Ligand binder design. Sequence first.
Ligand code: B12
Ligand code: B12
Ligand code: B12
Ligand code: B12
Ligand code: 5AD
Ligand code: 5AD
Ligand code: 5AD
Ligand code: 5AD
Ligand code: BR
Ligand code: BR
Ligand code: BR
Lengths: 197, 194, 194, 198
Amino acid sequence: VRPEDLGTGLLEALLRGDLAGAEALFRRGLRFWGPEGVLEHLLLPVLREVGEAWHRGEIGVAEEHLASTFLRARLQELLDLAGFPPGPPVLVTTPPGERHEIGAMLAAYHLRRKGVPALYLGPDTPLPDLRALARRLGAGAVVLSAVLSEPLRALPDGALKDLAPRVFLGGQGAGPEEARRLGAEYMEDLKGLAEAL
Amino acid sequence: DLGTGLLEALLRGDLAGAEALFRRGLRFWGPEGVLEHLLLPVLREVGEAWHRGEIGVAEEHLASTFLRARLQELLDLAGFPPGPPVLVTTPPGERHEIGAMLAAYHLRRKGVPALYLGPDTPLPDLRALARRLGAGAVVLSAVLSEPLRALPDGALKDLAPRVFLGGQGAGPEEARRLGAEYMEDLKGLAEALW
Amino acid sequence: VRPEDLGTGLLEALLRGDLAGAEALFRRGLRFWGPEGVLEHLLLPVLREVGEAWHRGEIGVAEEHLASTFLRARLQELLDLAGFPPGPPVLVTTPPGERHEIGAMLAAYHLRRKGVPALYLGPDTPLPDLRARLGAGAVVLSAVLSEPLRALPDGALKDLAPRVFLGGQGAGPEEARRLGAEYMEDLKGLAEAL
Amino acid sequence: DLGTGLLEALLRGDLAGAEALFRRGLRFWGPEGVLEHLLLPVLREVGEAWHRGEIGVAEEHLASTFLRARLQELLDLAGFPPGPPVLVTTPPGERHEIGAMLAAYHLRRKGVPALYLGPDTPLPDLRALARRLGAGAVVLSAVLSEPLRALPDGALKDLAPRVFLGGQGAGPEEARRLGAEYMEDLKGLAEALWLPRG
Ligand code: B12
Ligand code: B12
Ligand code: B12
Ligand code: B12
Ligand SMILES: C[C@H]1O[C@@H](n2cnc3c(N)ncnc32)[C@H](O)[C@@H]1O
Ligand SMILES: C[C@H]1O[C@@H](n2cnc3c(N)ncnc32)[C@H](O)[C@@H]1O
Ligand SMILES: C[C@H]1O[C@@H](n2cnc3c(N)ncnc32)[C@H](O)[C@@H]1O
Ligand SMILES: C[C@H]1O[C@@H](n2cnc3c(N)ncnc32)[C@H](O)[C@@H]1O
Ligand SMILES: [Br-]
Ligand SMILES: [Br-]
Ligand SMILES: [Br-]
């Protein structure tokens, strides 16, 4: 399989329920593109296409679920293989009501690859609870991934302002004006996140 | 006590310590054993501690997310046998997924190709995937009762030739109403296939 | 294959030239023991046994080569998957004359897993040329044989970088003292010491 | 010119930058292309720069170790097919291993189960392993000439049913003396093996 066909190959393996084949195709991508590269060039395009195919009525919700669950497992595997250094953690989650978690996982992964102790909480964390954990662990930052815009629109002005000494917001659902309204620093690029600390 | 030590390591954000304690459990008890003796008691205690106001939601999230990662690793270690799959998920509105993962694990350990979908699958979509994969069975984990109560009579009937329902949120009467076979314990689930 | 049989399984796979089987068994070990664990419980015992079988005349050099080369590849894979943080590097190598490199790779791996920017140079680096300017906060050396250390004059390791660590089967506290390095018994204690 | 950028990143100890430049090369040139356009020219230049005293041994080590790791990844990506293996190594006393790895890589790309042993294998031990595994061939990379000169006439002839020799340290006359089939080009290796000796 040529690299430019890995995405279709992987989606086709998943849609036939061939998890073993899908795992082999993902590892090929990992070896060809490298860790960050396989996420950019294989995991993300496949998930985007799964969303588009669902939207057009070509696949159902259970096919997306199968694929997303598989790809989340592949990223979790990579995350655990990255280093987890000592020192004040960075808490990584999604806003209340945001159930798309893979962006947050990606952010945690990019941070850990640069030696940052990113604690991935899972998605959908109430802000008082997030603030309390950050305070208790002496967390240097909180990072939020917003895939949809609506969970941010549901938050009052300044809702993110005091969660931790630094609060970063990114993802397709976020922009600079909404970050400003909510009292977070907007970050477009996962690359720029490690630098900013 | 490994369970208390694991929860304490998680609550300090000591992922390295937590992973070391989990691996000790795994080496001592083995795969099935670590679930029964460590993973499940910790999750139960996390729930109880949250309910009593002793821990917050972010602490439960960290612990649950960690343990889900460990169980996913055990799912991959059990392997995914060949042949017509058994689809495993949770009812629409059920966001507790670890029960479903557990069921998939126990089935895989008995050589059954349990394909874990993730949680919260609309029934028409689940039916369609079962049909497209020629799935011999569907298995649902219900942790809460409310998602089952929201479903129409007979809604689980014929998702596949065999449809199994278990978890704390399920009981025999609700399974009957919904057209599923009720399974009390994971032990009975593997048997009901083999 | 059960965890207790992974070591003999892996060695058997390697000795029959079954690299695909060997890779699968190594990954099983990785998933069961975790990254540091698979190195301690699978890579190291297999390599020890390879050495013992060679020394007793039971296997030839080509068989050891095959196994060592494979296991070095597996560790390099894990090393590249670990984070490589910014900041002043720690250079990792072996003394002049020391061609056993896997200990050094292990040291670099343990450091990277704790967020230390361990630059693995490969083995067998002339003490002068190791004067790599890059602002290295430390140098770490793995000694497998004792003879390459014995060949060095007193204090030969003293000022390679602000801190100089020495460990491995070929090193002890007295030899580290004579050469002017800090002795480290455990890979675990290496990251802490920084 | 990716080559100069890669070498400069490595000499700064910027592993992340070096890996990013290597991956760009992979995406532009593909697997065989990145070897020809990036890995090989960089190693050659590292050798020349050391020989002239421009870089030290630690710098060469850093670069060689990095590129060996990248090639090992490509070996695994090419896959290891089933069937009688081809053993790939270097002569006794030859510690340069990357040529052997290249040969294994080109064989695997053509579906040949090239089992890379690592470098520096005693001949009787190599012969014994080839015989025990029913290997169809042995392939040797000679970077230096001196390890070949040390060998007696015909030393390579019966290591396996077919024995191939190449690398900068080998030439046709030395291959003839040693009883190996000489190969210049890595691309021609799978072809040569698939056809009879003659
Ligand atoms: C899988 C998935 C789901 C799964 C998620 C499973 C899980 N995570 O456990 C589930 C089933 C939960 C789901 C639910 C729904 N989803 Co959905 N789904 C997706 C899908 C297919 C992939 C999601 C994914 O992981 N993408 C990868 C994402 C993270 O990458 P990315 O967004 O391109 O982000 C890049 C950058 O943003 C950056 N980044 C991300 N986070 C951060 C953070 C920081 C700090 C930084 C610096 C950078 C950064 O990283 C990426 C690298 O380029 C997408 C398709 C898509 N185009 O995204 C939809 C999609 C997001 N979903 C969509 C919809 C409509 C829904 C539902 C409303 C459907 C419904 N009716 O129930 C619900 C909403 C639930 C909720 N409240 O959140 C729409 C949203 C469209 C919109 N915004 O209007 C999409 C786009 C599909 C579509 N084409 O219509 N979904
Ligand atoms: C982790 C967790 C969450 C996480 C789950 C994350 C995830 N991705 O899975 C999140 C944050 C999403 C969550 C959300 C909520 N949850 Co919650 N949470 C839990 C917790 C702590 C663990 C869940 C778990 O994994 N259990 C798996 C194991 C531990 O459950 P078990 O009882 O041992 O299951 C056994 C059997 O049922 C069997 N089994 C399970 N499934 C199946 C299937 C078959 C076929 C068979 C044969 C057997 C079988 O296997 C197990 C061992 O035998 C529990 C505590 C608990 N006691 O379960 C609550 C708990 C289930 N949650 C609870 C509540 C109230 C909530 C929320 C309403 C909170 C809120 N206000 O938002 C929401 C509802 C979300 C939803 N719509 O589903 C309550 C429910 C009480 C009730 N029924 O009224 C609990 C019990 C906590 C408590 N003590 O109060 N939760
Ligand atoms: C593979 C191997 C080789 C390979 C190495 C390939 C490569 N690395 O590129 C090659 C073929 C080159 C080789 C050559 C030789 N080797 Co050799 N070989 C081995 C073997 C089988 C495995 C080595 C290995 O990688 N071990 C795995 C590592 C991870 O284990 P460890 O190194 O015990 O490390 C542990 C600790 O020391 C610690 N650690 C290691 N480094 C550091 C550093 C720090 C800072 C810290 C804190 C901890 C630490 O971490 C590890 C986890 O516990 C061993 C057998 C054995 N018992 O070690 C011999 C062995 C070491 N070799 C041996 C010999 C004799 C030779 C040769 C002399 C043989 C020859 N005549 O050619 C040469 C010498 C070459 C030279 N160095 O000059 C003997 C040495 C006996 C002795 N005590 O004197 C051994 C023990 C075999 C035996 N006889 O049983 N060898
Ligand atoms: C890195 C390196 C080392 C490393 C090896 C690391 C490892 N592999 O584990 C180490 C540190 C061991 C090393 C040490 C030494 N080496 Co050195 N180094 C190199 C270097 C830069 C790369 C070697 C390499 O990877 N070659 C692969 C590629 C780059 O070579 P190539 O010419 O493109 O090869 C092509 C063909 O030959 C073909 N090919 C190769 N094998 C085969 C096999 C078959 C069957 C086929 C068909 C084709 C084929 O494929 C390639 C592309 O087409 C070369 C420089 C060079 N080769 O130009 C030297 C070089 C070979 N080393 C040299 C020297 C001087 C030494 C030392 C003697 C230094 C010393 N005093 O210690 C030692 C000797 C070690 C030994 N006993 O072998 C000199 C050799 C001079 C000479 N006498 O001929 C070189 C040429 C450097 C130089 N320019 O001065 N070296
Ligand atoms: C964005 C993703 O959300 C999933 N999706 C759409 N509707 C639902 C629902 N009711 N329940 C669960 N998941 C849903 C689809 O599979 C889509 O691809
Ligand atoms: C059952 C689990 O649900 C979690 N939980 C309770 N309330 C919420 C909420 N609003 N958002 C997310 N998770 C919540 C708690 O952590 C509890 O432990
Ligand atoms: C410690 C390891 O060194 C290897 N070893 C022993 N003698 C040689 C030699 N002449 N050439 C290469 N490797 C050798 C053996 O395979 C042993 O296992
Ligand atoms: C061919 C390569 O061999 C390396 N080289 C030269 N001398 C030594 C030595 N004493 N020890 C290790 N490597 C050495 C140089 O770095 C050169 O680039
Ligand atoms: Br996961
Ligand atoms: Br390697
Ligand atoms: Br390839």
